[PDB]
Design a protein around this ligand. Sequence first.
Ligand SMILES: CCCCCCCCCCCCCCCC(=O)O
Ligand SMILES: CCCCCCCCCCCCCCCC(=O)O
Ligand SMILES: CCCCCCCCCCCCCCCC(=O)O
Ligand SMILES: CCCCCCCCCCCCCC(=O)O
Ligand SMILES: CCCCCCCCCCCCCC(=O)O
Ligand SMILES: CCCCCCCCCCCCCC(=O)O
Lengths: 251, 279, 279, 279, 59, 59, 59, 238, 238, 60
Amino acid sequence: SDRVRSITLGNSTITTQECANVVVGYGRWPTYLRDDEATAEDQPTQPDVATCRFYTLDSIKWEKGSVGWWWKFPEALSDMGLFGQNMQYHYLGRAGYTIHVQCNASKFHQGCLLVVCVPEAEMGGAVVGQAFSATAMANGDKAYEFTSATQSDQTKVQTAIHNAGMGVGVGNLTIYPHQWINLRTNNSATIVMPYINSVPMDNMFRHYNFTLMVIPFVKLDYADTASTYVPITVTVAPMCAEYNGLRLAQA
Amino acid sequence: DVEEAIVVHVADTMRSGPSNSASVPALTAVETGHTSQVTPSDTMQTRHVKNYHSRSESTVENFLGRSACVYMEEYKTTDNDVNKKFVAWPINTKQMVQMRRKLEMFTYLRFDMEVTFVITSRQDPGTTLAQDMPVLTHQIMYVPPGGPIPAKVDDYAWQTSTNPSIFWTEGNAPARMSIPFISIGNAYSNFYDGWSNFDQRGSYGYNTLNNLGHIYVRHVSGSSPHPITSTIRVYFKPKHTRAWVPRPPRLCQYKKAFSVDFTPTPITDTRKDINTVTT
Amino acid sequence: DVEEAIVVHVADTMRSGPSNSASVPALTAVETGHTSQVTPSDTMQTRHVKNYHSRSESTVENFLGRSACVYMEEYKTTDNDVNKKFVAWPINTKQMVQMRRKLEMFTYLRFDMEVTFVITSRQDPGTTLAQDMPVLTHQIMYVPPGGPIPAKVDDYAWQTSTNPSIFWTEGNAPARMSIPFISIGNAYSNFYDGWSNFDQRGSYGYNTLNNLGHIYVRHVSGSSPHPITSTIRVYFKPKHTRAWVPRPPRLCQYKKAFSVDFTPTPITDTRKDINTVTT
Amino acid sequence: DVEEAIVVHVADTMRSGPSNSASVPALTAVETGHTSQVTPSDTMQTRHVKNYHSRSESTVENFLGRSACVYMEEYKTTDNDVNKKFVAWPINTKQMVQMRRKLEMFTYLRFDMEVTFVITSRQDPGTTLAQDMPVLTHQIMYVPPGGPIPAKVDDYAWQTSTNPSIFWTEGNAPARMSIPFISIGNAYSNFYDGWSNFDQRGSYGYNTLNNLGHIYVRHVSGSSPHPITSTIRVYFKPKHTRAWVPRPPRLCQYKKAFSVDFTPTPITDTRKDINTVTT
Amino acid sequence: GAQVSTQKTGAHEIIHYTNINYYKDAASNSANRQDFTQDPSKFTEPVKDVMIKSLPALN
Amino acid sequence: GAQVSTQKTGAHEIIHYTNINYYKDAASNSANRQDFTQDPSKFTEPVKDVMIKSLPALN
Amino acid sequence: GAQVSTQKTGAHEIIHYTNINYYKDAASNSANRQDFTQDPSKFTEPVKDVMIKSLPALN
Amino acid sequence: GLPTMNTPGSTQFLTSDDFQSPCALPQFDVTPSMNIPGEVKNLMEIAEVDSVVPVNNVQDTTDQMEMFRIPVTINAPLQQQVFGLRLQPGLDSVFKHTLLGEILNYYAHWSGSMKLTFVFCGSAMATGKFLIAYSPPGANPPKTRKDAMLGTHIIWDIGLQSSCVLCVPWISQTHYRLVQQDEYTSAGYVTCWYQTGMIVPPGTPNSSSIMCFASACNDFSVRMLRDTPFISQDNKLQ
Amino acid sequence: GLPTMNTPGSTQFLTSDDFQSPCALPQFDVTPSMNIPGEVKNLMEIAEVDSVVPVNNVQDTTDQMEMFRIPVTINAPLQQQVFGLRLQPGLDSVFKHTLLGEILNYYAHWSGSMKLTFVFCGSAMATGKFLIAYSPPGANPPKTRKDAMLGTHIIWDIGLQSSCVLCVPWISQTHYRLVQQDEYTSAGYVTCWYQTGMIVPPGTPNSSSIMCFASACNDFSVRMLRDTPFISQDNKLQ
Amino acid sequence: GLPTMNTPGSTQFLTSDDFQSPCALPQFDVTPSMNIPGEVKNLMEIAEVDSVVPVNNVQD
Ligand SMILES: CCCCCCCCCCCCCCCC(=O)O
Ligand SMILES: CCCCCCCCCCCCCCCC(=O)O
Ligand SMILES: CCCCCCCCCCCCCCCC(=O)O
Ligand SMILES: CCCCCCCCCCCCCC(=O)O
Ligand SMILES: CCCCCCCCCCCCCC(=O)O
Ligand SMILES: CCCCCCCCCCCCCC(=O)O
C-alpha cells in the first residue's frame, strides 16, 4: 500500500498510516552548498544529527469558528534544541526543512485544510502607513490567528483572512508548494522545502525564509459526539543545515 | 568565419474510440498537491487534430520585454526656488502601478536593462510671452550610492569626471542606453520579509534592499527671460530576463510606494444567485 | 553562405492561313457558363507576332500595394472640453471610399500591414498670437480589445507597460511600423451575411466581425498659452497579399460606414439612340 | 584576410586544515619595506572557494577613460567690449578639481586624447526681446604655441590656412575629434620639481612645462539686434593610457590653478575615544 | 545571408540587386512584388466535362 | 562574425535574417526573444512518487 | 580587415563582436579597454633577496 | 562617405523595438549566476496550475470565505440543479480573478481546452452521484437535467477518490477566441445536477460542501499582449 | 544611396562611450616610447600596499602625529582593551583617508579579504602578548576579552619579529558590499586586548607605542566607478 | 563611426515605396493558412470573364 509513509531524521521517526503522497518543494531536494557557489571563506560547521531532527511545534485547537493560523520560520525554531544554539552563535545559516502537519478525526467529521509554504511572505500593517514591531507576526513557536473581519488595531498586521495578509486572493495560494488535509481521505500532510533565497547564505534572525499557513476552506462540522475540538500539531525537521561566522552569542 | 548559422507547437490531439475498462483517468485526488494531467482524449471520443499553435508570446522574455514608464517629473529653467530647477529621483520600480504589478508576479528577477528618456518643454503662461530662445540642452546624471549630490543647478558636482552622463538637445531622437545586472546579490528581490537590524528592528520590507542610486536632470545653461517648464519621462525595458518562484497577482489597489499596505477587498463581484447564467 | 542566388509574357500570335472545314471555333454556347477561348487566329488570317508585354502590374500584390488614407482627425493642445484634446478611433477600413472600394472587390483577404502616420500642426487664429513654443511631441497608443481606455489627456492609462506605443517629434520623418495578420479567423472578411445572436437577431453584417481595437493620440506634455491644433492621418499598405472569391465592383455611392445601404442607381448613361456613334 | 580572430579572475581559496609546525607565516618584519603576502588560508581553516570576480574595472585605461569637464566660459554675440565677444584659453588640466585629482594620482602619463565640445545659447534679459534670428554657427580654433592670436572677433587670424578648426551649427550633435600624444618629452609630467633658469631662478613647478597652445571660439557672423550669450564646455577623455610612479592622493583642497599651495588640514576626523565603536 | 536576384528591365535593354533582412519577424520584410504566375481556368472554364474549342459545344 | 538564423513565420507561408554585434559588452546586445523551451512539471507534478494517470491515485 | 573578438559576459550566461577601422591614424581608434594583465610585485616586493613567507624574515 | 538616405520611421521611439545600444558602465563585472529553485520560463506554466474558483457569488455573502463552497443537502427533489455558470474564463466574475483569469487578462486572444476539478468535502460516510455537463453555445441554456445530458457530460461517483475531472473540449468555429468575449465568440455553459441524491447515515451533518478548481490543458495558448484593466491609480504613489 | 533609419540615442553625448573620431593632426609623429621604471597597470596594485592607519582619534589630539600611535603601559588590569574600531574601510574615519580607503572611495562596491599588520615600537628589552580578534556582524560588539575570543583571533607574541598579521577573512552573505556601508551590509568589529601584560626591566621607559598598517589581499576587487566626495570647489580656480 | 552622407529624398514618405520596418507585435503567432476555393492572383483573370453589355441606351 502507498498510504503508509515513514520518515527517519536523526534520532526521531515519524509514522503515518493514512496519508497522501509527499510534495518536494519545486522538484528539488535539499543539499549542501557547492564549492563553486560559496562566497564565505572559512570552514563551515555541519552538526548533522544534532540539528537535523524532528521538533514538535506545540499544538492548537480546531474549532467550528476557526479561521486560520500562520508560523514564520526559522524564527519558530529560534529556541529549540541545538538548532537554536547554532542560530544564536553563528552569523550565517542555511538549511532546508521537512514540514509534517498532523490532524486526525473520525469518519463522521468533515472539513478541509490548506497547508502551504509561502516564501518571502511580506505582510502589510493594519493601518496604511504607520509601522509595527517584530512581535505582531513572530514571537517564537506560538501561532498567530487570522481574523474574519478587517483588523483595526494599528499595532498588528492586517489579518483579514480572504486577503491572506498579502493583498492577494486567498484562493490563488495553490501556486506555492502545498497540500490539502481532507478528513475523508487523509490525516497528514508532508512538504519538503529546499533552501530558497537570492544569496547563498543569510542571517537566520534578521530574515524570515518562508511562512507556513493553515487555512480551513471548509469549516469543521459534526453532530452528537463528545469530541468538541480537533487538535492540530506541526512538526518540523531541518535538513542539510550548515552555519558560518562564529561570534559571541545572541543575535 | 564570415557567416555562422544558428518551433515547438502545442501537443496534438490523438484519435480516441469507445472504451470500457477498469482504468479511471478522470478520477484523481487533489489532496496530493498534484494537478491532473488528463486530456479530452481520455474522457470522450476525439478526432485527430494537428495543432500549429505556439506559445511564443507567453515567454517571460516577451512578457516583460516592453518599455514601461517608471517616473515623470517637471523642472523649470528659471525660478526663485532653487530646489524647483532640477530633479533628484532615488531609483526604484514601485512608483508606477502597471509595471510594478507586472514585476511582482515573480519573487526574484535577473536581467539587463535598457533605459530611454523622453523630454518635452512648454512655455509657462503669463502676461508677456514674446521672446526668442535657441534650442535647449539637457543633462542626465547618474550618481551611484555614496557619491556627491548637487545642491543647486550650477553646483560643482555637475562636472562629472567618473559619473556617467548624457547631454541631449531638443528635436533629436530620445536618449537611450544599456545597463548590466548591477545587484550585489545573485538576483533582484521584489519582496524581502525581514528587518535591517540584527535584533529585528528598524526598516522592514523591500525598502531595505533599495540602494540603486539617484538620477539628476537640469538645463545645461538655458535660462530664459520668461519661465519654461520641462518634463522628463523614464522608461525601463528588461532584457535577457530570468525569473524564479512565481506568486499570485495582487488583488488590492496599491497605496504606498515603499510598503505592501492595503485595504481589504472582496474576492470578486456578485451575481443574483448560484444558478443565474443570463446577462 | 554569403550570397544565395534567387518573365512570363502574354501569348504570342501564330500565323494563320485560309481555311475551309467542318470545325466552327466561332460558334459556341454561353448557356454552359463557359467563356469562349477563341483567338483572332481562329477567325481571320494573322501574321506571326512576338509579344513582350507582361501582366506584372496587374497582380493583386501590386494592385493593393499602395498606401491609402483611412482616417484623419484633429485634436487641440489646450481647450476647455476634455474630450477634444485627444482622439479615439475604432479601427476599420470602411471610413474612406477609395480604399474601401479597392478592398471590397474581394470577399476574403489575408495580408500583413504597414502603417504610416502623418502629423501636422497649426496655430489657431486669435487676437494675440505672439508666443514662443518649443517643438511638440506626440504619442500614438494601440489598445487591443478589452484593454483600459484613457478618459482624459493626463490619465494613468497612458503609461503603457504592455500596449505598444510610438513617441514622435515634429520635424522628423513620419512614423511607421509593421503589423502581422491579426485575425482570429483564417482570413479577413469584407462581407458577412449573418447575425450575431444564434436566433437570427441583433447586429447584422460586417459590423459583427470588427474587433480590431482602438488607436489613441495626444500631445505628450505640450500645453501652449494659446491653442494649437494638430491633425493626424493614418495610411494602410497591405503586404504579402492573398485574395479569394472576386465580386463585382460597387456601382452605387456609399452612405454608411458600417452598412451596405444604398440608393438605386441607373445602370449607365444614355445616348440618343441605339445607332448613335458620333460624339 | 576578411576576418581575423583576436578573463583573469582573482585567486581562489584553497582548503586548509589544522596545523602545528615551526613555520610562522603570520610573523614578519615591516622594516624590510616588504608587504606581507599572507592569505586567510595561512592563519585559519578555510574551505575551497572558486572565485569568478575580475579586476576589469580597476585598470588605468578604464579608470581614466571617462569624459570630464576641464573648462567653461561665456561669450556674447554683440557687445561694446571687444574682449568679451570671444574666448581665449591656454590649455591646461589644472582648472577643474575632480579630473585634476584623478590625474595627479600618477607622476607621468602618456595617452591619446578625445575632445568634445558642448555649446549652448540663451537670450539675455531686457526690456524688449521680440526678434527673429536664424540658427547660429560657431568656430573653434586651435593655435599651437607661437602662432598668431586674434585680437577681435573679425580679425584676419580667423582665416586659418594651417591651424585646425571646426565649424558647428546649433541643433546638431556635439563636435568631437581625436588628438595624438603631442608632448616634446617621452611622457606628460603632472609634477615638476625644478626651475626654468639654469641658476635656479624664475618660474617654479609644473607651470614651466605647460606649452600646449590656446583655443579660441567665436560666433562666425551672428550679430543679433539684441545680445545673446553662449557658453562652451570642453571635455577630455584619455585613450590608450599608460602611467608610471603612483603617488598618494591629495588631502588638502586646491587653491591655485598653477601651484601646489595649500592650507594644512587634519589627518582625519575624530571620535570620542579609542574604544568608541558605536554610531 | 544575402539574396541576389534580377531586377525588372528598363530603358536601354548589371540588372542584379542585393537584399538582406534585418528584423526577426517575417512581417517586417519588404513586399514580394515579383511573382507573376496566374491561371484563369478557375473562372473561365469551371465546367465538368472538357470542352474542345474546335468542336461544337452542345453535341 | 555574422549570425544567420530563421525569422518567425508570417502571412504567405527568404525567412532568414542577419545579425552583427557592434559593442564590446554583452549587455548591449538585442533581446533574445526566440527561445521557446518550457517545462511545467516543477509546478504541476511536485510529488515524490510518480503518479500514473490511468491508475487510481490513493492506492 | 575585420577583427572578431569576444565581448564581456553579461546576464544570462553569440558573445562575439566585429570591429573595423576607418581612419588612417592609430589615434582615431577606440579605447583598448580589454587588457587585464597586472603585476603588483614592483610595489609589494621591492626587496633584493627573495623572502619566503613561511620562513622567518630577519634570520 | 557612404551615401545613404533615411526612410520613414527614423528617430521614432517604439516601445516594443529590438535594437542595440551603448553600455553606460563599460566592462562591468556581473555577479556569478546561481540556480535558485523554481525557475519559470513561460507564463503558461503558471496558468496550468489549479486554483480555487469562487462559484458561490450569491450577492448576500456576509462572509467572503463562503464564496468558495457550494452547498449540498440530503433531501432534494429528484432532479435539481447544484450550480450553473458561463464559460468566459477572462470575463466572467467566477473566473475573472482566478490564477487562470489573471493570466488571460494580460492577453487578447486565447484557445485550447480547460480542466474543471471538483472535490467532495463531506463526511466519509456520505455518498452520492452528480451529473456535470458542458453545453456548447446555443440560443438557450439548459433548464433541466434532461436538457443538460444531451451535451458533453460525466457521471461522478463519490467514493474513496474524492475528486473528478470534467475536461471541457475546444469546440469552436475559429482558431482563437476573444478574452473580452462577445456574442460572436460565445463559449457555452456549465451546469451540475443531482444524479441520485446525497444519502447520510445517523449521526452525521445534514449538509456538505463542494469546491471547484480551474486550470488549462497542455494545448492552451494565448496571444496579443495588452494591459490589464484590473489595476489603476489616480495619483503618483509616494 | 543605402536606405537607413536612425534609432533612439542618435546625436546623444554619453560620457562613457567608445567610438572612433577623426584626427585633428593627420600623420603626426609621436615621440618614441621609453620604459620609465615603476609602471602601474591596475589600481589594485596601489591598493595592495600598506599604509599607516590613524587609530588614535581621541578628539583631543593637539598634535596631529599623535594619531598614528596607540599607547601602551606597563601596569594595567589583567584584562583590558587596547583599541576598538569598526570594519568600514571606505566610510570609517579610521580607514577613510588611508591608501586603501582613498581608492575605495572612487568605487561603489567592494569585496575580498584584508590584512591588518601591527608593529611593536617599544624597547628591545620589553615583552608582552596581545590578543587581536575579529568579530563578524552582530547585534552587540564584544565588551570583554571573553567575548572577543569567541571570534576569529590570533595571539601575538612580541620577540625578534616585530610584526604580526591579522588576516580578516571575507565572511558575507552577498558577493559584494557597499562602500557607503549601511546596516544591511555591516562587516563587524576589530578589537585588541592584553593577553599577559607588558613587562619591562629597570632603566627603560614605562610606555610604548604600536602602529597599524592596512592593505588588501590578492582576492580583493572593486566595481562601479563613481566620483569621490572628498574633494570639492566653490569657484573656478585661477 | 562609419562616415556617411545623406542624399536627396531623405525622410520623404513615398506612398509606393518598398522598405523594411520594425514589427509592433514581436513573435506574434499567425493563424494557420487554409486553402479557400477560388483564389485570384491577377486582375486579368477577372477581366477575362464575360459580362452583359447594356447596348440599348436609348435615353427613354
Ligand atoms: C527592482 C528593480 C531592479 C532593476 C535595477 C535598476 C537599476 C537602475 C540602473 C540604471 C539607473 C541609472 C540610469 C541613468 C544612467 C545615465 O543616464 O547615466
Ligand atoms: C478589413 C481590414 C482588416 C485589416 C486589419 C487591420 C488591423 C489593424 C492593425 C493595426 C492597428 C493598430 C495600429 C497602431 C499600432 C501602434 O501605433 O502602436
Ligand atoms: C597634463 C595634460 C596633458 C594632456 C595634453 C593636452 C593637449 C591638448 C591637445 C588639444 C588642444 C586643442 C584642442 C582643440 C583642437 C581643435 O578644435 O582644433
Ligand atoms: C542586424 C544585421 C546588420 C547587418 C549589417 C549589414 C551587413 C554587414 C555584413 C556584410 C554582409 C554579409 C552578411 C552575411 O554574412 O550574410
Ligand atoms: C564596429 C563594427 C562595424 C561593422 C560594420 C558592418 C560590417 C562591415 C563588414 C561586413 C560584414 C563582415 C563582418 C565579418 O567579417 O565578420
Ligand atoms: C573607409 C572604409 C569604409 C568601410 C565600409 C564598411 C565595410 C564595407 C566592406 C565590408 C567589410 C569587408 C572589409 C574587408 O574586406 O576587410
